[PDB]
């Protein structure tokens, strides 16, 4: 079915991966006020500032 | 079915990947006020400032 | 079915990928006020400023 | 089925992976107030600032 | 089925992995107040600032 | 004599210097033959291919 | 004589210097033959291929 | 004579110096033949391939 | 004579110096033949391939 | 004469010096033949391949 399957014929190979990830933040910081009082039937979710530069995920189910 | 399957014939190969990711933020920071009081049947969701420079995901189900 | 399947015949190959991603932000920051009081049947969603420079996603189901 | 299965023919190979991950934070820090009083049937979740530079995950079920 | 299974023919190979992970924090620290009083049927969860530079996970079930 | 001497009044300044210097060479290389046999009173000088992309020189005497 | 001497009044300054210096060479290499036989009164000088990307020199006497 | 002498008034300053110096060589190498036989009054000098990426010299006398 | 002498007033300063020095060589190597037979009054000098990436010299006399 | 002499007023300072020095060599090695037979009045000097990545010299006399 597959004899070579993508053969790579070379002699000299030089690669330089330059990954410059610069994440700046707020020196003063953030300020938020949230109020939650269960009584009926509702959903509430609050997340704080997060830093996502790089991530490696091949396969994931329900994050 | 596949003999070579995309053959690469070369002698000298030099590649330089330059990834310049510069993410700036608000030195003063952000300010937001949210109010939530369960009683009926509604949905509420609040997220804070996030930084997404680069991400590698081959396959993902329900994020 | 496929003998070569896109053959690449060369001797010298030099490539330089220049990715200049500059994301500026508001030094003063943003300010927004949201009010939510469950009682009937409605949906509400609030997101904060996010920075999306680059993203790599081959396949994704329901984000 | 597979004879070579992606053969790599070379003589000299030099690669330099440069991963520059710079995560800045808020010297002043963040300030948020959350109120929760169980009584009805609602869901509430609060997360604090997190730093995600790099992550390696091949397979994951329910995170 | 597999004779070579991805053969690697070379003479000299030099690789230098440069992983620069810099995680900054808030010298001033964060301040948050949460209130929880069980009485009805709701769920509440609070997490403190965490630092995630790198992680190696091949397979995981329910984290 | 000088009070301000070129004052710079601003609030926000963002500059991005992009210096793309690409120097190509002759994969085949050069070939030159020179003959010199001292006997009289003459001067001879031979230089090989050089690459000059950028140079910073404030002051120089006799190069 | 000088009170301020070029004052710089600002609040936020972000600069990104991008220096991309790519110097290619001759994979085949160069070939030159030089002959020198002292007998009279002459001067001879031979230099080989050199790579000059960047140089920082404030002051120099006789190089 | 000098009161301030170039004062710098700021609040937030972020600079990222990107120095990409790529020096390629001749995998095949160079080949040169030189002949020198003292007998008269001449000067001869031969140098081999050198790589000059960057150099820092404030002051130098006779190099 | 000098009161401040270049004063620096700031609050937050983040700098990232990226020095990428890549020096390639000739896997095959170089080959040169030199002949010297003292008899008259001449000067001869031969140097081999050298690698100069970076150098720090404030002051130097006769190198 | 000097009161402050270059005062530095700040609160938070984060610097990351990245010095990537990669020096490659010739796996095959070099080959050179030199002949010297004193008889007259000449000077001869031969040096072998050297690697100079970085050097720190404030002051030097006759190197």
Swiss-Prot record, chains A, B, C, D, E, F, G, H, I, J:
Glycans are attached at residues 17-18. There is a cross-link at residues 4, 18, 35, 48, 54, 58 (Glycyl lysine isopeptide (Lys-Gly) (interchain with G-Cter in ubiquitin)). It is linked to In Alzheimer disease, the neuronal cytoskeleton in the brain is progressively disrupted and replaced by tangles of paired helical filaments (PHF) and straight filaments, mainly composed of hyperphosphorylated forms of TAU (PHF-TAU or AD P-TAU). O-GlcNAcylation is greatly reduced in Alzheimer disease brain cerebral cortex leading to an increase in TAU/MAPT phosphorylations. Frontotemporal dementia 1: A form of dementia characterized by pathologic finding of frontotemporal lobar degeneration, presenile dementia with behavioral changes, deterioration of cognitive capacities and loss of memory. In some cases, parkinsonian symptoms are prominent. Neuropathological changes include frontotemporal atrophy often associated with atrophy of the basal ganglia, substantia nigra, amygdala. In most cases, protein tau deposits are found in glial cells and/or neurons. The tau/MAP repeat binds to tubulin. Type I isoforms contain 3 repeats while type II isoforms contain 4 repeats. The modification N6-acetyllysine is found at residues 18, 27, 35, 48, 54, 58. The record marks 4, 11, 27, 31, 35, 48, 54, 58 as: Not glycated. Phosphorylation at serine and threonine residues in S-P or T-P motifs by proline-directed protein kinases (PDPK1, CDK1, CDK5, GSK3, MAPK) (only 2-3 sites per protein in interphase, seven-fold increase in mitosis, and in the form associated with paired helical filaments (PHF-tau)), and at serine residues in K-X-G-S motifs by MAP/microtubule affinity-regulating kinase (MARK1, MARK2, MARK3 or MARK4), causing detachment from microtubules, and their disassembly. Phosphorylation decreases with age. Polyubiquitinated. Requires functional TRAF6 and may provoke SQSTM1-dependent degradation by the proteasome. PHF-tau can be modified by three different forms of polyubiquitination. 'Lys-48'-linked polyubiquitination is the major form, 'Lys-6'-linked and 'Lys-11'-linked polyubiquitination also occur. Disulfide bonds join 28-59. Promotes microtubule assembly and stability, and might be involved in the establishment and maintenance of neuronal polarity. The C-terminus binds axonal microtubules while the N-terminus binds neural plasma membrane components, suggesting that tau functions as a linker protein between both. Axonal polarity is predetermined by TAU/MAPT localization (in the neuronal cell) in the domain of the cell body defined by the centrosome. The short isoforms allow plasticity of the cytoskeleton whereas the longer isoforms may preferentially play a role in its stabilization. Interacts with MARK1, MARK2, MARK3 and MARK4. Interacts with PSMC2 through SQSTM1. Interacts with SQSTM1 when polyubiquitinated. Interacts with FKBP4. Binds to CSNK1D. Interacts with SGK1. Interacts with PIN1. Interacts with LRRK2. Interacts with LRP1, leading to endocytosis; this interaction is reduced in the presence of LRPAP1/RAP. This is Microtubule-associated protein tau. The gene is MAPT. Expressed in neurons. Isoform PNS-tau is expressed in the peripheral nervous system while the others are expressed in the central nervous system. Changing residue 33 to H: In FTD1; reduced the ability of tau to promote microtubule assembly without having a significant effect on tau filament formation; effects at both the RNA and the protein level. Tau/MAP repeats lie at residues 12-42, 43-63. It is found in: Cytoplasm, Cytosol; Cell membrane; Cytoplasm, Cytoskeleton; Cell projection, Axon. It comes from Homo sapiens. Coiled coil: none annotated. The modification N6,N6-dimethyllysine is found at residue 48.
């Amino acid at each position: 079915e597959n004899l070579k399957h993508q053969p790579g014929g070379g002699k000299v190979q030089i690669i330089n991966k330059k990954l410059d990830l610069s994440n700046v933040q707020s020196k003063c910081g953030s300020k938020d006020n949230i109020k939650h009082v269960p009584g009926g039937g509702s959903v509430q979710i609050v997340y704080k500032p997060v830093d996502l530069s790089k991530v490696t995920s091949k396969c994931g189910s329900l994050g």
